[PDB]
Every structure is written in C-alpha cells, then in structure tokens.
Amino acid sequence: MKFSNITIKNFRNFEKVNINLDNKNVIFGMNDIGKTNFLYALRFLLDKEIRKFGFNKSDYHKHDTSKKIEIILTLDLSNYEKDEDTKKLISVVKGARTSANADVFYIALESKYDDKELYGNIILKWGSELDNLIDIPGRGNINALDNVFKVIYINPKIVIYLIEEPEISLHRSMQIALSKQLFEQSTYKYFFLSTHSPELLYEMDNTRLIRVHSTEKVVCSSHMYNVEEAYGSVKKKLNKALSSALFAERVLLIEGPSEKILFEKVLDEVEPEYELNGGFLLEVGGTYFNHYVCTLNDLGITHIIKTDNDLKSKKGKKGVYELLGLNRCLNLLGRENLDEITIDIPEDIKGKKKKERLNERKKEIFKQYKNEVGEFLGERIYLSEIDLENDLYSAIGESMKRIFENEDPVHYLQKSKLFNMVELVNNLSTKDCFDVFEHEKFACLKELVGS
Amino acid sequence: MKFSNITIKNFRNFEKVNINLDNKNVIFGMNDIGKTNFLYALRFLLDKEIRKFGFNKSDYHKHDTSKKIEIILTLDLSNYEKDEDTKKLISVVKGARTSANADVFYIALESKYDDKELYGNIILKWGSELDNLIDIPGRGNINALDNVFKVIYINPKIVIYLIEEPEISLHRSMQIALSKQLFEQSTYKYFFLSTHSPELLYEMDNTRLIRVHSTEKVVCSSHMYNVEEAYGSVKKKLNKALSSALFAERVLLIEGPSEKILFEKVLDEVEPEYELNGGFLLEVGGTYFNHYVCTLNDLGITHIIKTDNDLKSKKGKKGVYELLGLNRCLNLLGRENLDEITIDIPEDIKGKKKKERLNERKKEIFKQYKNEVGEFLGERIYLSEIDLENDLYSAIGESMKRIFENEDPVHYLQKSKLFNMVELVNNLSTKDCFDVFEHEKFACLKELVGS
Amino acid sequence: MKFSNITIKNFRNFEKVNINLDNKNVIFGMNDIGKTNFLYALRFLLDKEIRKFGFNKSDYHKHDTSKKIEIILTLDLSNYEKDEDTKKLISVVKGARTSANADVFYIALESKYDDKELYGNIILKWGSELDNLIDIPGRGNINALDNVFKVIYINPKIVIYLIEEPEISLHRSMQIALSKQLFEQSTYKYFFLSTHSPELLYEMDNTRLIRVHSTEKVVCSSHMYNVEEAYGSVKKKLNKALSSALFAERVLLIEGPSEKILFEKVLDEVEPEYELNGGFLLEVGGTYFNHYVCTLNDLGITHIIKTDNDLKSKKGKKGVYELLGLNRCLNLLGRENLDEITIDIPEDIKGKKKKERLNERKKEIFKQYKNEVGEFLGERIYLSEIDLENDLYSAIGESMKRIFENEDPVHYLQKSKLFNMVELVNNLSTKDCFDVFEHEKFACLKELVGS
Amino acid sequence: MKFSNITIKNFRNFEKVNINLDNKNVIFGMNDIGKTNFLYALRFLLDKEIRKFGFNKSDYHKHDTSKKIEIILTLDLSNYEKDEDTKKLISVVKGARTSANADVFYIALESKYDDKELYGNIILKWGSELDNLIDIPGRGNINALDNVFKVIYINPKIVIYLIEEPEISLHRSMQIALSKQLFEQSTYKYFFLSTHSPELLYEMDNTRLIRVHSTEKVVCSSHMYNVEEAYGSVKKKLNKALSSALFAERVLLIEGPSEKILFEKVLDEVEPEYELNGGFLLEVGGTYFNHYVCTLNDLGITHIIKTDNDLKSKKGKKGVYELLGLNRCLNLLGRENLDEITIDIPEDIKGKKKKERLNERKKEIFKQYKNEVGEFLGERIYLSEIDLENDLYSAIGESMKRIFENEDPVHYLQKSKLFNMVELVNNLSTKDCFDVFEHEKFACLKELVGS
Ligand SMILES: Nc1ncnc2c1ncn2[C@@H]1O[C@H](COP(=O)(O)OP(=O)(O)OP(=O)(O)O)[C@@H](O)[C@H]1O
Ligand SMILES: Nc1ncnc2c1ncn2[C@@H]1O[C@H](COP(=O)(O)OP(=O)(O)OP(=O)(O)O)[C@@H](O)[C@H]1O
Ligand SMILES: Nc1ncnc2c1ncn2[C@@H]1O[C@H](COP(=O)(O)OP(=O)(O)OP(=O)(O)O)[C@@H](O)[C@H]1O
Ligand SMILES: Nc1ncnc2c1ncn2[C@@H]1O[C@H](COP(=O)(O)OP(=O)(O)OP(=O)(O)O)[C@@H](O)[C@H]1O
Secondary structure, X not given: OOOOEEEEOOOOOOOOEEEEOOOOEEEEEOOHHHHHHHHHHHHHHHOHHHHOOOOOOOOOOOOOOOOOOXXXXXXXXXXXXXXXXXXXXXXXOOOOOOOOOOOOOEEEEEOOOOXXXXXXXXXXXXXXXXXXXXXXXXXXXXXXOOOXXXXXXXXXXXXXXXXXOOOOOOOHHHHHHHHHHHHOOOOOOOEEEEOOOHHHHOXXXXXXXXXXXXXXXXXXXXXXXXXXXXXXXXXXXXXXXXHHHOOOOEEEEEOOHHHHHHHHHHHHHHOOOHHHHOEEEEEOOOOOOHHHHHHHHHOXXXXXXXXXXXXXXXOOOOOEEEEHHXXXXXXXXXXXXXXXXXXXXXXXXXXXXXXXXXXXXXXXXXXXXXXXXXXXXXXXXXXXXXXXXXXHHHHHHHHHHHHOOOOOHHHHHHHOHHHHHHHHHHOOOHHHHHHHHOOOOOOHHHHHHOO | OOOOEEEEXXXXXXXXXXXXXXXXXXXXXXXXXXHHHHHHHHHHHHOHHHHOOOOOOOOOOOOOOOOOOEEEEEOOOOOOOOOHHHHHHHOOOOOOOOOOOOOOOEEEEEOOOOOOOOOOOOEEEEEOOOOOOEEOOOOOOOOOOOOOEEEEEEOOOEEEEEEEOOOOOOOHHHHHHHHHHHHOOXXXXXXXXEOOOHHHHOOOOOEEEEEEOOOOOOOEEEEEXXXXXXXXXXXXXXXXXXXXXXXXXXXXXXXXXXXXXXXHHHHHHHOOOHHHHOEEEEXXXXXXXXXXXXXXXHOOOEEEEEEOOOEEEOOOXXXXXXXXXXXXXXXXXXXXXXXXXXXXXXXXXXXXXXXXXXHHHHHHHHHHOHHHXXXXXXXXXXXXXXXXXXXXXXXXXXXXXXXXXXXXXXXXXXXXXXXXXXXXXXXXOHHHHHHHHOOOOOOHHHHHHOO | OOOOEEEEOXXXXXXXXXXXXXXXXXXEEOOHHHHHHHHHHHHHHHOHHHHOOOOOOOOOOOOOOOXXXXXXXXXXXXXXXXXXXXXXXXXXXXXXXXXXXXXXXXXXXXXXXXXXXXXXXXXXXXXXXXXXXXXXXXXXXXXXXXOOEEEEEEOXXXXXXXXXXXXXXXXXXXXXXXXXXXXXXXXXXXXXEEOOOHHHHOOOOOEEEEEEOOOOOXXXXXXXXXXXXXXXXXXXXXXXXXXXXXXXXXXXXXXXXXXXXXXXXXXXXXXXXXXXXXXXXXXXXXXXXXXXXXHHHHOOOEEEEEEOOOEEXXXXXXXXXXXXXXXXXXXXXXXXXXXXXXXXXXXXXXOOHHHHHHHHHHHXXXXXXXXXXXXHHHOOEEEOOOOOHHHHHHHHHHHHHHHOOOOOHHHHHHHOHXXXXXXXXXXXXXXXXXXXXXXXXXOHHHHHHOO | OOOOEEEEOOOOOOOOEEEEOOOOEEEEEOOHHHHHHHHHHHHHHHOHHHHOOOOOOOXXXXXXXXXXXXXXXXXXXXXXXXXXXXXXXXXXXXXXXXOOOOOOOEEEEEOOOOOOOOOOOOEEEEEOOOOOOEEOOOOOOOOOOOOOEEEEEEOOOEEEEEEEOOOOOOOHHHHHHHHHHHHOOOOOOEEEEEOOOHHHHOOOOOEEEEEEOOOOOOOEEEEEEOOOOOOOOOHHHHHHHHHHHOOOOEEEEEOOHHHHHHHHHHHHHHOOOHHHHOEXXXXXXXXXXXXXXXHHHHOOOEEEEEEOOOEEEOOOOOOEEEEHHHHHHHHHOOOOOOOEEEOOOOOOOXXXXXXXXXXXXXXXXXXXXXXXXXXXXXXXXXXXXXXXXXXXXXXXXXXXXXXXXXXXXXXXXXXXXXXHHHHHHHOOOHHHHHHHHOOOOOXXXXXXXXX
16 A cells, blocks of 8 residues: 555645655645645545535635535555555455455545535545445444544644644754654654755655645645665765755755855845845755756756866776766766776876866867757756866956966966955955856856846 | 843843843744743833733742842943934933933833732832932823833834744745845844744844853853954855854864765764754854854854864965964964965975975974964864874775775875765765774864763 | 424433423523533434534443433324425435334434544434334435434524523513514424523413423423413413412412512511522412412422412302302312302391301301311312411411401401501511411411421 | 712713712613623723723724713712721822811822823822812822722622622522622622612612613613611512512502403503513502602603502591592602591491492592692592592493493402402403503503503
C-alpha cells in the first residue's frame, strides 16, 4: 500500500485537479487558502468529525454550476505479504476486491446537490475499478472505512497525521528538531505537512514536495524528492541551502561567497528590493547542478545558473585536463560526459605564462563550442569565458585600474579574492554597478529580477 | 528627549533590574515569559487600559515579601530647542521642572500593598530628581501623564509602538519588508519589538538589541548597535549573517565555504545535534572581526574565532607584505596596528618554491610571536600556523595520501578548494573525523560544542 | 397516527420508565434535570443534530452496568384515510408494515457499548411488532426516518415542537398570550412543553400533563386532561385556579373567601411558611369536585377537601330539598346520586326558627349517615356538621362571645360573612388560632401541613 | 442617613428626571430598557468597575445635544448619633461639611464632552449645598467616595445590593422565600430590585415601589408603601392580591367570587383578550378601599371600584344601622364618617317584608344622596342601588325568569349565590352578556376595557 494520487474535482478552490502523492507529503506555498483547503479536503475524506457535519454552501466551487463533489484516493494495494497495512486493508473488504490479480484500489467520495434541505449527504464507495463501484456497508453512525484509518490533526489502524503550521511561537532549534523527528524517525509513516519556515526542511528525504503557486487559481506542482548515494556526504548543507531556496520564485545559482559580495553590492545599488519580490542567491559549490535543477524544475521554480569555464586536472597524471564546466551543463541537458583534453606545457614561467596559456586554451575551447554555449544561454544556463573576474574586467576595468595602483587588477583580485573584493565593493559607485548590470555577460542578474 | 533606562524593581519576574534603552529597542531571546512581561511592564507604565485594572496577586515577585512595585523611566530631557517632543513634554510640567539647568527627568510608578481589598492602587509621580518627587495632578479618570504619550499595541502626542511576534502566519519576504519599514523608515520613531524570526533583522541600524538569557531568572543584556562608515558597503550581508547568529548561544566564526563543508562533515560525524543545542557556523569574509565581536560580547554570546596566518601584499610596491591575520587579532584585543614586513624574493621557481619560502617566513613569524598566539588562544581566538589545510595535513594526512594519487595532497587540495574538498568529504570515515575533532589544532570545534 | 407512549430504558436519569403520551404534551415539576433530559431524550430520538454527535460517557445510567440504551416510541398508525400524516408515514415504509391489518408501529432506538473507541453508535429500527424488527435503510448521512419527521427546538414533514422555559424575561400577559396560542390555535399540533409559570396554563385543554416528582429518582405521572361539556362555561377560572394548584404538593380545597381569610389568619399564626413548603389554598365554588380530583389524583398531588353539609331547594317546588353536600362526596367515591328529602315546614317564625329546624334536620342527616362520613374522613374528604361557623363556635366560642356584644355570635357572623370575619381576624390572638388548629373538626389544615 | 432622591439628568433614556427614594427600593414595569439603565446609572454612580471604563457614545441621550451627564444623589445626613452609617459618612468628609447645622449632603457625578479622544472623564464632587461644591480628594486609582460605599450586583462599609430578575429558572416557593428574606429580614438594609414575578412581592412593607410606564419615554412613578396598624391582620392576602394587581394597567375592584364568575362569563363572551391587554379583576373583601387606592394612585394605575349599597347593623343595639357603602366612598374622597341611621322595624314577616322595607330604605337613601353618587361616578367609583343582583335583574330579568321556574329569580339567586350563579352562567347566551355589558349600570366593565 502506497498513496498514489488524490483527485479533488469539486471543492472550495478546485476544478479538476490531480495531485500526485507518496508517503510523507509536504505542502508549501504562498496561497494560504489552498494549503488550508487541501487539509480540509483530506479531513472531509478521512475524518468522521468533519464528514458528520456535511457540506455547507461555502464549500462548493460554483454554488449552482458543477454541483457534484468527488474526492477519489488511489491506494495501489498490491504489495508483499509481510506488510501489515496491506493485509489490514484487504481483510476489511469482501466483494470490493473482485479479482485477486488486481492492483489498484479506490476510495471514492461523492456528494449530492445542495438546493433542497441545505445539506450535502456525503456518500462513500469502494471497488477495484472506477466503473461499477459498490457502496461501503455500514450499520449506524460508524462507516466500515472508519474501521481502517485514523486521522490526527495538529494545530498550535492506519494512522495519518496532519500538521498545520508548527513554527508558530517556536524557536529555531525546535523547528530543526521537529524536522529531524519528522523525516529521519519512523514515528510518522503517513503525514501531510504545511509550513512557512525553512528550518523545518533542513533534513528532508523520501518525500513529496508540493508547491502551491502564487496565483489566485490553485496550481499544484509535485516532485518525488530524494537524495542519491553519491550526494549523501554533502546532504544537509544542500538541504539547508535548498530549503531557503524553496520559498522563492526566481533563484540564481552561484558558486563563491565573493560572487555573493559583488552581486549583492550590484543588487542594492540597482534593484534594492529583490529579496522582497522573490529573488534568492543560491551558493552551489563543488557539486553538479542536476539534483537542484530536477527539484526546482518539477516544483515549477525558475532556475538561473551562472558558471565559469573551469579546467580540472586529474589524479596520478600530469598535462591532461578535464572539461568540468562544460560537463556540468552537458549533464544538465542530458548529454554524455566528454573526453579528456591534454595540453603539452613546459616548465616556462610558472607564475603568469602558464595561467595565460591556460586562459588561451580555455578561450579556444569557448571558441570551438560556440553553438553549445548559445544552446545553454538559450535556457537559464550561462557559461563564462574564462572566469567572472575577466567578465568583470570588460565592464568596470577602468574603475579597477583607478582603485588599485597595480597595472593588472585581475591578477591582484585573483591573488586574494575576498579581501580585494571587499576593497572593490568599498570604492564603488552607482554607475559602476549599472555598468556591471547593463552588460551582456551579466544578463542573468536581470533574469534574477525579470522586471 | 531620548529614552535612557527603565528600572523595573518588583514585577512578575524582576527583582532589581536595569535595562539600558535608546529609541528603537528590540527584545529577543528564549524566555518567552520575560519578553511578554517586559511589554506588560511598559503597558502598566504608559497605557491607560492596563493601568486602570490595577494589580492582581499574580503580578508580584514574591506575594508577601518585597511588596512595593516601582517602575522608573529615565528621559534625559535637555536637548536642542528645535525638537518638538522636548517642548511638548516641558510645556505640560509646571513645578516638576525645578531648576532650568537640570538634565534628567523621571516618570516614577509606585504601588501600594495587596493584602487588603485585593487591589494595587498604582500611583504615578514627576520631578527632576529621585528624592522630593511631586504627584502628577489629575482631575478625573485621565492623568496628566496621559496627555503627553500614546501607546499602540500590535498583536496578530509622543507615540510608542509595541509589536509582539509579527512573523506568525507570515511569509519570509513580508518579514524582510517589515524589517525595512521598521528601521529605515521614520514612521516608527519609538518602538519595542519582540521576535523569533531572523528575517525581521536583515536591515537593522541605530537600535538596542536586548537579549533575554535562557535561564529561568531573567538576565538582560543590552547593546547600542550601530554600523560604522567603513562597513556601510558590506552592511546587509553582515546583517543577514549576524541576524541568524543572534539566535544562537555558541557561534564559531569561520572564513570560507570549504571550511563549512569540512567542519560540517566533521560535525555530523561527531556531534550530530549541534544545531539543536545552540551551535552556529558564521562565515566572516574580507572584513575585520570587532564589529561582530562587540555586538556578541555586549549581548552575552560566546564568540569563537578560527583564523589563518595570512600575508597580504599592498598596492604599488613589490616585496613588502602586511601582517593581516595578526592585525585582526591585535585589533580584537585593542592593540595598535603593526608595521610592514619586507621579504627579498628572487624570481626562483614561481610555482612551489615561492610558496615554500612564504610558508617558512610565516612559520618564523608564528615562532617569534608565540606568547601573543597563546594570549589569543587564552580567549576564543585561534590563529593557525600557515593555513587550515596544513593543520588538516597533521591529522588525516595518511587519509589524504590514500584518497588522492598525488604525492603532495595539500597542494592538490589548494589547487581547487571546493571540488577537492567535496572529494575529501566523500571518501571519509568516522575515525578520520574523530582524528580531526580530537586534535589540538582543531580545539575550537569542541568550543563550539562545549560538552 | 397518535403518540401513545415512549419507553426510555437507559438514559441519564432513567431505568425502565414508561411515560404515556398524547399530542400536546406538557411536562412540569421541581426536578429541572429530568425536565431537561426528557427533551434531550426526544432530541436523541428524533433530531439529526444531537444524534450525529453520538453518546458520551455522561449519558449512561450506570457507566459499566446496563449498557444498552433503548428509546422506543409508539405510534398506533391505523386511522382514517383522510388523515395526511398516516399516509405520509405509511408511504415511506415498504416491508416494515408486514400485515395490513396491524395497528401499532414502533420506532426503536438502540445503542452499543462505550468501553472501546469512546463512542455510542446509535442504531434505529422499524417494524410492526417488537420482535423481528428490520433496520431502517439509509444511504449516506441522512436516514429514512429523517424524511418523515422534523424537530424545532425553542430556547430563549411531521413537525414536533420543543419549547423549554418560555417565561424567562417575559411579562405576564405575554405568557397568557403564548398559552392561548399554544392550546386554542392549531399551529402547534405536536409539542412538548416545559415551564415554571402558572400563567402559561390558563387556557389548557386536550393535553397531557406530566408531573415530574420532587424526589432525586425520576417519577413521572401522566393524565389525559380534558374539560367536559357541562364545565365549559366556568372553564377558564377553573384553569386559573388549577394552574396555580399544579405547582403545589398539598392542596386544600375550600369554598369561600371568608374561609381563606380565617384559615390564612390561623396559618400565619401557627405555620407561617406553609406556602414555602408546598401548601396551597384552592377556592372551589359552585361546582362538583371530581374534575379537580381526577386531575390531581392522576398527577399524584394529594387533594384535601373541606366542605359543609348543605341543603339545596329545587325549582318549581316548595318544601323539598336536595342533599347536595352529601352527593358531591358520593360522586367523589363513585356512588350514585341520592334521592329527594322533603321537609314539612309551616310559616312559623321565619327569621331564626326555620334556620334552627333546618339545622336540626341537617344534624339528624349527619347522625344517620355517620359511617359514610367516617368513610369520607377515611380519605381527605371532610364533611362539616352544619357549616364551618358552627365548627368555629365549638373552638373559639368564648372569644366570639367576648369580641361581639351580641348574645349569639354565629348568627351575627352569618349576617355579614366578610366584614365580621375581618372583625374576628382583627381581635384574635395566638392561642385562639392554636385552639382552632388543634381541634378535631379542623384536622384538614394539619393535613395541609403534614408535619 | 436615608436615601431621598436621585437626579439623573443625561443618561441613555433620561432627560431631567427625578425619582424619589427611600431604603428598600423596588423597580418594576414593562420597559425593560429603563429598568436595566436605572441599575446601570446606579452602577455608574457607585461602582468602580463600571466607572473605570468611562462613557461610550451609546450612553448619551442625544449624541451631540445636551452633552453634560449629571447624577446627583441626596442623602439627608442629619440623624441621631447612635446610627453608625451617619458617623461613617461624616468622618470621611473634612471640609465638604461646612456648617454643622446643615442637613442635606450631595454626591454629584459630572461628565465632560465626548467629541475628542472618545472618552467621558467622570468627575465626582462633594459638598453640603448645590453651589460651591468641592472635588473629592483622591490619590491614585481609588477615590475617597469608594472608602464609604460598597456595591454588590446580583444577576442569575455601607452596602448597597442590586438584584436584577431573580425569578429566572426558579420555582414559585423559592420566589416567596426570597421575598420573605428581602423585606422581613434585616440582612438587606439597602437594595434596588427589578422583577417580573408577583410572587416576589407577597410580603412587602416599608419600601418604595417604582413603576416604569409602558411608553417609550421613561416615566417613573414612586410611592412610599406602608401597611398601617389596623390592616396588619389581613396584610399578606392583601399583598397577594395587590402584587398581582401591580403588573396591570386597568384594575377593577370587586367584592365577591360570584361577581368574578358572572363578570368573567360576560368578559369572555364580549372581550375575550382582556387579560392580554392589561385588565385585572381584584377581589377586595371586608376592608376599606383607600390603602389599595393610594398605592395604585401614586403608582399611576387606574383604579375602578364597583360596590353595593350596604346597611350594617352594629353590636349591642337593635334597629340602628350604619351607612357602610357610603362611608367607604366618603373615606375615598376624604370626607368625614357619617352618622347613625335608625329604622323602626316591627316583627312583621321576617322572610321577605323586612328585606323589602330595607331595600326601600336603601332606595330612599340612594335617592336623597343623588349628587354624591354622581360625584363618585364622576371618577371610577360606582355605587349600586341595592345590590348587583338587582342591577342584573334590570338587564337579563326575562332570561332569569326563563331559566328558573321560580317567580322571583333575585331571591332564588340570593338564597345560594355561588351554585345558582353557576346555573345562571351555564344557561347563558352571547346576547345576554351583551345586554349586561351594554347597560348603564355595568359601565365599569367598559372602564376595565377602555376600547
Ligand atoms: N608579483 C607577482 N608577479 C607575477 N606573478 C605573480 C606575482 N605574485 C604571484 N604571482 C603568481 O602567482 C602564483 C601563485 O602565487 P604564490 O604561490 O607565489 O603565492 P602568494 O599569493 O604569493 O602567497 P600568499 O597567499 O601566502 O600571499 C605564482 O606561482 C606566480 O606565477
Ligand atoms: N603540477 C604542478 N607542479 C608544480 N607546481 C604547480 C603545479 N600546478 C600548479 N603549480 C603551481 O601553482 C601556481 C598557480 O597555478 P597556475 O597559475 O598555473 O594555475 P592552474 O591551477 O594550473 O590553472 P587553472 O585554475 O586554470 O586550472 C603555479 O605558478 C605553480 O607554481
Ligand atoms: N335581629 C335579628 N333577630 C332575629 N332574626 C334576625 C335578625 N336579623 C336578621 N334575622 C333573620 O335573618 C333573616 C334574613 O335577614 P333579612 O332578610 O332581614 O336581611 P338583613 O340581614 O336584615 O338585611 P341587610 O343585608 O340589608 O342588612 C330574617 O328573615 C330573620 O329570620
Ligand atoms: N320560600 C321562601 N319564601 C319566602 N321567604 C323565604 C323563602 N325561603 C327563604 N325565605 C326567607 O329567607 C330568610 C332566610 O332563610 P332561612 O333562614 O330560612 O334559610 P334557608 O336559606 O332556608 O336555609 P339553608 O341555607 O340551610 O338552605 C327567611 O327568614 C325568609 O324570610
């Protein structure tokens, strides 16, 4: 038994929607009314204390048009025989399971009209297929569906928890403790969680993320969120960055903290309320992009990636290099991992001429894959020429020549990135940040704003 | 007129306390009862709708011992004559201002005993000095103190706002918008703010931070928080880091993101609930430490600093270097900025021998200031020998020799810090993180835990 | 269709009780808890909004012993075919009416145990006989019993009203208007009424009076109250006297207002709180007793009758007399109406000798029916010798000789009854009222007190 | 000290009213809003918990016109020195009692305007005369008027009780017990009582009755109600009749129960809702009228008196008679008690000729005081010719000739009044009751209806 999907046709803010499910579902978003009414739809399906009051006039979509409320839940009941819950649901049914090789089982809610006696009359049915459903046999005030499930609702037998906004009047470390108790522990096998706090998602795994969109009409995006085997050692700082990234609409994926220093200076000199409108700067370091990108893509969040063209030397060999910054974007568009590039380099002068011939080989590599770079730029993936300091030299290079007394300011900024980045931020004006922001190689910051 | 201090002697959780004030006071902490009763003490001093009900038996410290409730507020009323509020308070008083060259004015609340008629009888007095106070003359239900001030209390004439927990059922960007409206705008000249969210302090300036301690007895620490003129370009990312650091008890100050990757791997292999007990990793990059350290020191938060011995070359000259990592700790202990150190370096071999002779000069500089290093280590300031990769080589250097096929793993890790740090984290065990954590040059992580 | 009886076995204050019913039932008494729980038992039988909440632990008689709640209602459904409600109940049933010549139909409530899941599970059944009942077929939240009846509950489809205490914050004439609207008008065919006010029963006819007794255990007495054809001209002053008599426990039935003056003087000189303990003086004038006596007997109220031996002359004949005061008590014990007694009286002296020979003939009639008088006295019926002034002469006759200056005070008191009764009350002492109250011919006043 | 009057000028339903007071004040009527706002005016004068909230906009008479609320209470403080409350009020005042021979002391409430700050600011003053009042000196939240009095408000130090509607959900004998505890016992020296039940006034003495009239404008009538020394033996049945008479508007004062039988038959054959509109039949027997008439006159209730011309023989003498029915109406208009009338009567025929010559002497007495009878009829006092049976003979005498087979039906009805009155009621039609009601000697029943 594993919760597959719930079909909410007619309810307070729903028309013909499907939400895919698994166990441990998490709903979040900016529409508070849809996050309330999703848990109210689950309480009308599976709790006696909400279903015994019936339907009012307020819980209809249009009050005279499409007057048939249906909630259908999908269970997928064929599983291995050592599971207790599969036997506990198949023992209660008698003729609702018709053929023993069937796989899918439905719990179908139906309602009648409201125009006479001002009442809903919720009617619940069982069966293995959608046509020829059979009524659930009850005798008094207790249905036979109520002898299977149990619902506990938390606000500040197969057991389904419903936790609504647990961060209210709560400290930060208690929210991280509640996140660790929710996902790592096996106390809560089935829940549905609504939250506004990113500290309640610092340890999340094997879960559905449900994002409710910011529109007035309810749009639901669902993702089967997992952390893979190679990502398990950098897992919780990835979850700490991504849990703050889940409450945004437009997210820029950067690498360094000095990039955050420079871009945040350019942002509060140009667009000083980017954090109010839904912008977020996400630091991604030392990993590939596609675990972030599949999560934000299936949750409907626009992902913008700014990256540099890096050359990585491998272990045990000298003079052979890997095309790392190409291969991350090739993994993002689903293509295969590229081959080895070897460069024959002498001893030469090691301080600057080796860096200059590596920059010239990166310039030739950026030249001969120009249509692939445009393909990446076609989306929100932006690959730099050599680095971002050399893209910064093409915009404010006279300013970098007049702040520092050195002749070459790019090498002086690359000698110590953080302290000379703070010295570049401190002697900077408004027109320099507009020269950075208006440039064609820093277009992605405009894609962070979008207005 | 400027709010100096409030003396709460007898109230629900107070004995003889003083809290220093300014305008725009912010109270935070883990004692919710003291943060409620501070605003209740201000409502009993300055609001009619709480003062007209009197005192019960529950708002006494001991119910039979020390039965004299006093709230005394300090105003410091001498100011320039173009201020409207100084004239609006000095026009109402007639004989309470005795001598015209006086500076300090008091608003003194007093209460009587509770053992007969079960009532408090709050009595309010004026005067320029603490002895020979005069009664405030009123006529009916309205006091003459009520013709000066006005109190608006917000829960989800000189005007004093009182905002209690505004982040409840609220989105993140609305909390950042409320922070920008609270501190940058001049709509709220006087307030007292209680919060649990770090996003309500992302733009804070010219304010009192009040930290209520985690003990059962109420301890109040207050700091006159300001951002100086040289720190104004890196101001709001400093406030974003420090606002999450204000809700912790033990804070480690680090520099890089790769240090956060390595230390966070060592932390969830050794002490996996450090974030639950009050630990926090704070990234400080490119700035001096003392603006963080004066704020956390006057708020009573233990600050732990891990830093490396850096040599910084200056602009316009070659072969002369600055002792930057010494001078940050010398600024932390209040000593003067050190002189210039020049090193005569030939052309040599630029790739490794220049780095080796710079490491040997840093080793000699760490040798000849050994008593200063112990002095720093005497507190929570920890200065590394060359870097933290060389301190990591002394603990897990056989592991770094067996992961990478290179002969020297320190130079390979310093070639690309982030990606080889993720490769060092991925091939790492429990005993390697215990070898890092048990070492004498990584003692500060134990100071992050303290248990 | 006509409501016959309700059998409440297990409920909050009931063990195996039966209450006989008709349409327009009225419940009254001093047990407020039983008058609340009777209407709660009807709401649990016939209202959806009480039956959907189920049973708690508090609505059981003993919480572990006799755990089977049964409410059975009797309908007697065979009637003439022009009644709409008989066809509206027989159209809904299909197989619950088995044989077409059956007369009695039952609505049977049943409940299960409470020791597991803390719930009652009310189960409702139909059928023509008590064994082999069939379940009421429903489909959702709406039963098929709910498609017949409708319950409106009033507190300050076949339609059943439930009015609980309508005299609260209400004027007296509005209570008399509500009584006239309740019983004379045909707006309320079916109701159940609880009241504390006697002005809500000033016009009552064709109704059940239900008296709940003053004990802690619930005792229900029911009477089919009607006013007959010969009593219809003196009907509403009889209802005004009897409606105040229904809220008492011990009621003395007297005739004159001068008897009320004398007995009320004797009562506040002997037992000054007789009205507090449940005593009531009821004036019955010009009628027979048995309409009062059948109502108070079937409602369980002890009726005490004090009466005089009267001789009534008939119309159109002279010298023949009727034994009226004997025949009222003979009608009370169910015996036949006695014959005519003729007395041959000359012209004589008309003022006193005719009254003396009529008193001697009444003394001979009281002599020769002595065993019948004892039979009446055996109950609470007390027949005087001649009048009550002559019984008053045997107790306080020296006091009546010393107040009035006339030789014969009985004839002077019978000349003007009211004004000389006020003159006898005004010159009276405590020992004279104890001489009246301790006498053997005024024992019935002691039967008014009983303690 | 004795409460004299309260002057409520501006309040919710008051303009310039005076209500005279004593101790033990009782307010009753049909305006529930005025009975609520009288106790709210006393709570605003004398209770801290209502006065500390101030005045809203709703408790003004006109919201912009006559914006000065004044409540002035009169105390009359000069009394004998053994009274404790006089010394307890004169000890608290210091200069408010100016001259020691003064008698009257005032408690003056004043209020300010409401158009700025939305507040009332109740100001209380003391002094011996109405001009040159002095402020009551207080120090904090407690006034010095609050150190004298104490107010307890009951809803289902000098101590003032306020009991509002205590008959709600209460039995009848508990209301009579509460009446006996209120007036006979000295537990409640000062109260103000509002009620709707006549059983809470069955033992009332030494009290103010306040009747609030049925109009929308508040009219207050007050009477100093007492029972005199000669009326003390018939006191509580007089209070039982008069307490039901206090809740009516038009009251007919009759004598016998047979008059109630006949008039109540004529009333439900002509005006069947006389009890709904405010009519009441009051039985007065054996007493004079003026104790009822002074109470109903000072309470503003229209009193209608129907009486017969009676001749009363005195004690110890024969042949001399008293003009009783004249002298009750002469006491009602305040004239002196008339002399003795002697009639020389022989032995004659005692049965009918003595009654005929007494009726002829009553006819001559009704002839020679014709202008006095018209004077009585000028008001609502109606004196019959001989009796009311002889006035009934002039209207329905052919009906009385056709019901009874006797030749003279007046003597047959006067032989037994009650049983032949029930026989006259039983054989009666609608046109006979219209012949009674339309007659000029039964005009007072029309004065009972008035429409
Ligand atoms: N002044 C310079 N002129 C030319 N090349 C330089 C200069 N400084 C540094 N480089 C280049 O930078 C490379 C790396 O620098 P190096 O290993 O000497 O460390 P560093 O930055 O001088 O040391 P530290 O970080 O301790 O200040 C050198 O191999 C050399 O090619
Ligand atoms: N294989 C090596 N052997 C010895 N020294 C090396 C080696 N690789 C790098 N270095 C040292 O590191 C210094 C800085 O490296 P360099 O400027 O050549 O960039 P890089 O790390 O090779 O380039 P990129 O970042 O594009 O991969 C050199 O001046 C040299 O002293
Ligand atoms: N003084 C008396 N002595 C003897 N018998 C009397 C006396 N007074 C009245 N009676 C008797 O009472 C009977 C009825 O009284 P009657 O008809 O004379 O009226 P009343 O009571 O005198 O009149 P009223 O009611 O007008 O005062 C008489 O027939 C007579 O037998
Ligand atoms: N049939 C009659 N004819 C004439 N006068 C009568 C008649 N009956 C009664 N009376 C008058 O009524 C007066 C009072 O009546 P009386 O004393 O005889 O009592 P009663 O009414 O006959 O007795 P009881 O009340 O026991 O029936 C008599 O004195 C007489 O004058």
